[PDB]
Paper text:
Collagen's structure involves the assembly of three polyproline II helices, with each individual chain consisting of a three residue repeat sequence with the general form (Glycine–Xaa–Yaa). Within collagen's trademark triple-helical structure, three polyproline II helices are stitched together by a network of interstrand hydrogen bonding along the central axis of the right-handed triple helix. The triple helix is stabilized by the backbone NH groups of the Gly residues acting as hydrogen bond donors to the carbonyl oxygen of Xaa position residues in neighboring chains. To gain atomic level insight into these new rules we present two high-resolution crystal structures of collagen triple helices, with the first peptoid-containing collagen peptide structure.
Author numbering:
A (entry chain A), B (entry chain B), C (entry chain C): 1 to 30
Amino acid sequence: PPGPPGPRGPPGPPGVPGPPGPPGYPGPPG
Amino acid sequence: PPGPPGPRGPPGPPGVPGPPGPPGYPGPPG
Amino acid sequence: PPGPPGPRGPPGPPGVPGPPGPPGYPGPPG
């Protein structure tokens, strides 16, 4: 009958880059 | 002959942090 | 004998959102 399963495979690739952050705060009064 | 391939590896690390957001809106008029 | 290593894991989660962008420019003069 078949031999034992092999070792676990390696870790996956990193996820995709995160989303751009939100807009910054409004500038100061002119 | 060799047994079955091992189990699939774990999920990878998180992706790189996202870029900084767009510049904020201009301030109010002086 | 034991099988070959398993397949590579799935991708990690998406990166975190970036930080808020730079502050806006100063408003126009009154």
